[PDB]
Structure 1
């Protein structure tokens, strides 16, 4: 039973007026402002809006919320339902924490009563509402327009709104295909492939780009080309696939080529399909974001044959393997030990059904291919650069009282560390290069000079063994001694300040998307190699859950791709139905 509905995004070509001026947006905004600004008693009082005309009209009458001319039941049932569910979402967010605390309290109290100890006093349950009765965590306005059956997208016709500078395809005719034979384009004409490039052209089912695609002309370091946005815009607009959504007197026109590419790359259809049946692979209820200008379509329930599973763990995994091998008794596995050296390590095996037991048969071991490792390294360099820039900006814009403290924290060089150490009677002939975090050569030198008071001794518990161990203070411990810290008050401030600027810079989101895409590339490569190495269509992913001065600085590359690769591998259960054995 296919149950996943992935998205597809299309661009908006022409509007009657900005979406923020439509009555549906205004009524949504008003309803949300009303509901989020009322008490618990009023929510019960103002909660009989119903799913009917005779109830919605009275709700808008007594509450006083302006209807702004929007009086559609099928589009208001979404607005009211979403608003009240968002209202109820804070309450149960608080309730979940409350019931976690209640579960720990119940277990601790019953254990104490079994041991004879009286139950401990329970913690004061946090409340979702404030003093007067309003919600402390007030939800914000959702700036989205949810289309409905009565305003479903339809192919554009000249006898609909003839003011468009566009054209319109026949909804029943086959959709146009791109440039069929690019090698026969005359010289000096757009799309011309020069002779020298012709021998080394690609032979796979690569996505064809038109000559006016912005990816072909974007301002790159080594392009030596000129970008004319108007020319590419008009060239693209001459060959669009327009669809239209009409809500009341307003309308928007969307370019359906995004839907076309979505259906082509997924293989749910073949070239030679009409606009009526292109729209039939998606729901009739897209979502509009006015700030961007994107219409997000969602695949209809059945277009993508993905049964979204969840990452299994423990006993259930054994029966998962048994069920998989019961139908097809040849199942492939990949063991991703991504902790060591190169980002991804694999271990393929083919497992059969021995009645009730498993007999794994190894099939090899590979690593992440080199040509992808350069891409990962390039991304890491770019991400380090942008992280340094955003951190520097956050420090610069920090409040002056915290600015001075942070700046003074960030001068702790080796010479500055050595200065006060030498001032403490320590000689400079120490092997400064040769310390580790465990060495005590400074303490040994101080003791050899008779300086016993300065060498502080720490009593360390011997784990499970009773007794405390007296040890000379670590040299790295002396390093902590020389450096004052931010007393976990300024650290809070800089964290909140860097989160905001990290959200705000348009580069950080771009490199976050790039990290996600690179992780997905790694996962896709491993999945394809698992299929090719095991010769089985059904597979399963068994994931298993220098220098002295360099010790002063944080580790540049210690654990970066681990979490993103783990998330990408766990996403196969959510997006593509691949079983994931987290062990």
Structure 2
């Protein structure tokens, strides 16, 4: 049963007035600011808004929240059921911990009676059936400098005769590039794509955004959403690309049926200018599972092999010099036991490893350029303290132990952590009986083994408290300037993309090596966190079982 609905984002080409000034947005803001600032008794009393016109009108009558002229029942139910659920999300977040305590109780209501942690305003316009997107029609819709395609006529492709375009014209592939072109079904980029003109280290081209914008606008696929007397006009080529890369639609489809793979209830965020569409329940035939927790794997694979008589595995072994050391296998079903035959183990290829090691030199090179400039901008009283702490214990503890009078040359190098040589060199200058001791818990229930301290324990005790004076300057200004640089939010997405690239390569090699469409991924009981998250996400985004053995 298909139960996953991945998103598809489209751009906005025109709009009557900014989305923040629409009556629906103002009503949503008013309702949210009213609901978030009321107590539990007021929530129980003011919780009879219902799903009827006679009930919504009565609610807006007694509460007195401005209605801003918006009186649509379909679009108001979405606003009010979300807003009260957001309010009743503080209670259950705390109440989840309340039952953890049972397995002074925490309360989400403060002394004033209102929520201490109250939710912010959601800046979204959730569309409904009555404002569903429709193909742009110049006669029936406001006039725009755009061409509306025939809803039933076949949508055009890009440039069919790519090699026949003459010289001196857009899209002309030069002769010397002809011998080595691509042969796979590659996504076709038009000549006005910003990716082909973006500023680069050595691109040596001139980006005239005006001509690219005009050329892109002359060949758009306009669709229109009207709410009340307002409207927005979007570009549907994002939906076309979404249905093309997934293979669910072959070229030669119309605009009436292109919108037919997506739900007619988009979501609009005014700050960016993007409409987020969603596939219907069945467009992408993906059943979203969750990773298996051990003993359920020996039941999952039995049923998986009960359908396909040959299933392929992959043993993702994180934590080596190569991040992904895959180990393939194939399983057969005889009885209650599964029989496997290894096929071989590969490592992640060098080119992808090169991309990883060139990204890893872009994050450690920004965690310096951000953290250092966050440190330099502390107040002088905090800045001097943190600077002193940074250089603290470098030679301070060495000077202290020399003041103690021990021989400061035996533990010179590597400290021989196996033999806890700190205690040895304390014993050297007659400090054997002043050696501080540590308790051990070797016993199953308890244990009193207060004995010579280990080297790690010595390091813990000899080093000072470091930066506990503030703990809210270095740990706060850095995390505040993290969002002040767009490079960080770009690098997080780059890390996720690289992790997904590695996962995709491993999955396709598992399919190829095992010669089976049904495959499974097993993970045992840096890039480690992002790779584990990416490998676990296949059960939720693509349906491939993931096992934590």
TM over 0.5: yes
> Partners in 1 of 2:542 and 2:342 — Cα distance?
25
| TM-aligned CA distance change 1:180 to 1:28, over 3 Å | same
Q: Deviations over 1:309-343 (max 9, x none)?
A: 11122332222111111111111111111122210
Contact map agreement 1:405 1:486 (CA 8 A) in 2: no
Contact map agreement 1:3 1:302 (CA 8 A) in 2: yes
Tell me, what secondary structure is at the counterpart of 1:433?
coil
Name 1:562's counterpart in structure 2: 528
> Partners in 2 of 1:80 and 1:487 — Cα distance?
47
| TM-aligned CA distance change 1:480 to 1:174, over 3 Å | same
CA-CA distance at 1:485 after TM superposition: 2.4
| TM-aligned CA distance change 1:404 to 1:475, over 3 Å | farther
> Partners in 2 of 1:476 and 1:578 — Cα distance?
43
Tell me, what secondary structure is at the counterpart of 1:233?
helix
| TM-aligned CA distance change 1:565 to 1:467, over 3 Å | closer
Q: Deviations over 1:497-530 (max 9, x none)?
A: 3333323421111111111111111110010000
Instruction: Provide structure 2 residue ranges, at least 5 long, that are not aligned to the other structure.
Output: none
Tell me, what secondary structure is at the counterpart of 1:410?
helix
CA-CA distance at 1:481 after TM superposition: 5.3
> Partners in 2 of 1:340 and 1:52 — Cα distance?
61
CA-CA distance at 1:291 after TM superposition: 0.4
> Partners in 2 of 1:255 and 1:501 — Cα distance?
35
Alignment length (residue pairs) = 548
Contact map agreement 2:411 2:425 (CA 8 A) in 1: no
> Partners in 2 of 1:440 and 1:314 — Cα distance?
39
| TM-aligned CA distance change 1:100 to 1:469, over 3 Å | closer
Contact map agreement 1:426 1:446 (CA 8 A) in 2: yes
Select between 446-455 and 134-143 the one with higher mean Cα deviation: 446-455
> Partners in 2 of 1:86 and 1:446 — Cα distance?
61
Contact map agreement 1:409 1:485 (CA 8 A) in 2: no
Tell me, what secondary structure is at the counterpart of 2:291?
coil
CA-CA distance at 1:494 after TM superposition: 3.1
Q: Deviations over 1:335-373 (max 9, x none)?
A: 111122210011111111103321111111111111111
| TM-aligned CA distance change 1:478 to 1:581, over 3 Å | closer
> Partners in 2 of 1:445 and 1:74 — Cα distance?
79
> Partners in 1 of 2:405 and 2:99 — Cα distance?
59
| TM-aligned CA distance change 1:458 to 1:87, over 3 Å | closer
TM-score normalised by the chain length of structure 1 = 0.89
Q: Which one of the candidate residues 481, 490, 513 is aligned to 2:461?
A: 481
CA-CA distance at 1:174 after TM superposition: 0.9
Q: Which one of the candidate residues 306, 312, 315 is aligned to 2:292?
A: 312
| TM-aligned CA distance change 1:474 to 1:405, over 3 Å | farther
Q: Deviations over 1:248-300 (max 9, x none)?
A: 11111111111111010000000110011111100000000000000000001
Select between 93-102 and 61-70 the one with higher mean Cα deviation: 93-102
> Partners in 1 of 2:324 and 2:289 — Cα distance?
23
CA-CA distance at 1:392 after TM superposition: 1.9
Select between 288-297 and 340-349 the one with higher mean Cα deviation: 340-349
Name 2:68's counterpart in structure 1: 68
Name 2:373's counterpart in structure 1: 393
Q: Deviations over 1:159-217 (max 9, x none)?
A: 24444222221111111111112211212211121122111111111111111111111
TM-score normalised by the chain length of structure 2 = 0.94
Name 1:573's counterpart in structure 2: 539
| TM-aligned CA distance change 1:387 to 1:86, over 3 Å | same
Name 2:11's counterpart in structure 1: 11
Contact map agreement 1:409 1:483 (CA 8 A) in 2: no
Instruction: Provide structure 1 residue ranges, at least 5 long, that are not aligned to the other structure.
Output: 103-122, 545-559
CA-CA distance at 1:423 after TM superposition: 4.8
> Partners in 1 of 2:445 and 2:49 — Cα distance?
67
Name 2:92's counterpart in structure 1: 92
Contact map agreement 2:86 2:119 (CA 8 A) in 1: yes
Select between 421-430 and 460-469 the one with higher mean Cα deviation: 460-469
Select between 26-35 and 151-160 the one with higher mean Cα deviation: 151-160
> CA RMSD, aligned part only?
2.3
> Partners in 2 of 1:263 and 1:196 — Cα distance?
34
Match status 1:343 vs 2:309: no
Tell me, what secondary structure is at the counterpart of 2:195?
helix
Q: Deviations over 1:13-36 (max 9, x none)?
A: 111111000000000000001111
Q: Which one of the candidate residues 135, 142, 156 is aligned to 1:162?
A: 142
Tell me, what secondary structure is at the counterpart of 1:432?
coil
